[PDB]
Amino acid sequence: HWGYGKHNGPEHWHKDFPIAKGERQSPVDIDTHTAKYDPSLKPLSVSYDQATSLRILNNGHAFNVEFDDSQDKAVLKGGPLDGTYRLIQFHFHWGSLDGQGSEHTVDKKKYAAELHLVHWNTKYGDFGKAVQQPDGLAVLGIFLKVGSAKPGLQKVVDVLDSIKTKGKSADFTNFDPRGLLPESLDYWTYPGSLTTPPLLECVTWIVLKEPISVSSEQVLKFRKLNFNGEGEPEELMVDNWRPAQPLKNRQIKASFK
Ligand SMILES: NS(=O)(=O)c1c(F)c(F)c(SCCc2ccccc2)c(F)c1NCc1ccccc1
Numbered sequence: 001h002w003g004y005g006k007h008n009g010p011e012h013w014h015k016d017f018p019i020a021k022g023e024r025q026s027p028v029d030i031d032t033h034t035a036k037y038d039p040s041l042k043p044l045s046v047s048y049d050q051a052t053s054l055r056i057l058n059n060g061h062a063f064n065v066e067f068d069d070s071q072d073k074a075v076l077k078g079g080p081l082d083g084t085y086r087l088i089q090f091h092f093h094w095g096s097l098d099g100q101g102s103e104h105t106v107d108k109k110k111y112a113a114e115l116h117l118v119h120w121n122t123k124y125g126d127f128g129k130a131v132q133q134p135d136g137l138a139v140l141g142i143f144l145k146v147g148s149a150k151p152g153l154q155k156v157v158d159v160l161d162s163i164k165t166k167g168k169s170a171d172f173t174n175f176d177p178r179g180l181l182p183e184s185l186d187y188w189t190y191p192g193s194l195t196t197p198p199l200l201e202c203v204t205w206i207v208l209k210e211p212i213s214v215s216s217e218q219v220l221k222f223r224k225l226n227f228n229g230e231g232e233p234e235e236l237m238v239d240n241w242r243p244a245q246p247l248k249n250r251q252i253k254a255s256f257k
Pocket residue numbers: 061062091092093116118131137139193194195196197198203240
């Protein structure tokens with residue numbers, strides 16, 4: 001029932017998911033002048049050499065590239081995190097137009113899209129248990145702007161026609177998520193939530209400062225996906241982002257400068 005459309009979009013979510021109006025909701029506007037450099041933060045450690053991608057799924061809201069997380073193979077640690085977070089899936093949010101699409105904003109600036117690499121804290125044993133904990137997830141957020149193509153994204157763009165509609169999936173092995181990272185790992189971090197229902201307040205957000213560039217042709221292919229299932233009227237999958245939510249009693253910390 002929840003979605004992005006005219007009648008079931010983010011402004012409606014609170015009726016099924018009252019935590020929508022909670023104290024640590026995401027995304028947020030990153031006010032770069034008020035984020036405080038925190039010299040006690042660590043460099044982030046992104047270890048994806050052993051990543052095992054399995055499958056790509058259109059779930060009717062976005063597409064997820066799913067990983068094998070039954071062993072320590074693709075982990076995020078360091079930075080603001082204690083302990084070890086496994087990679088479980090990544091997905092994107094994007095706009096109908098290049099001027100919008102990202103969920104976090106930077107001094108109110110919207111990017112064309114935003115990548116979310118989702119990881120769960122191994123101390124809780126699995127994803128379903130982790131999301132019930134305030135430190136259960138670490139999401140690495142990366143902005144996309146339109147300019148030169150991102151070679152490491154092409155294998156993703158090229159399988160999308162095979163998962164056009166809701167519920168379709170395709171084998172997606174041997175995908176290396178290192179090809180989606182920018183050069184710098186400088187980041188902002190704050191405590192937040194999943195940006196989709198159930199909107200659980202279980203996420204340490206780590207949002208990279210440096211955006212990656214993707215081509216206009218790459219993002220156009222994202223916008224040919226469908227929210228609807230096969231043999232339903234076409235509703236293009238665009239504008240699947242939640243707008244910035246109030247920061248409330250939170251501090252965003254910078255790893256740099
Ligand atoms: N967008 S996000 O990075 O904050 C995110 C996340 F961190 C997750 F762990 C997950 S999986 C957690 C979902 C869940 C469902 C039922 C019960 C418990 C938990 C996300 F789906 C998304 N959302 C993905 C998405 C994007 C666009 C449309 C629909 C879903």
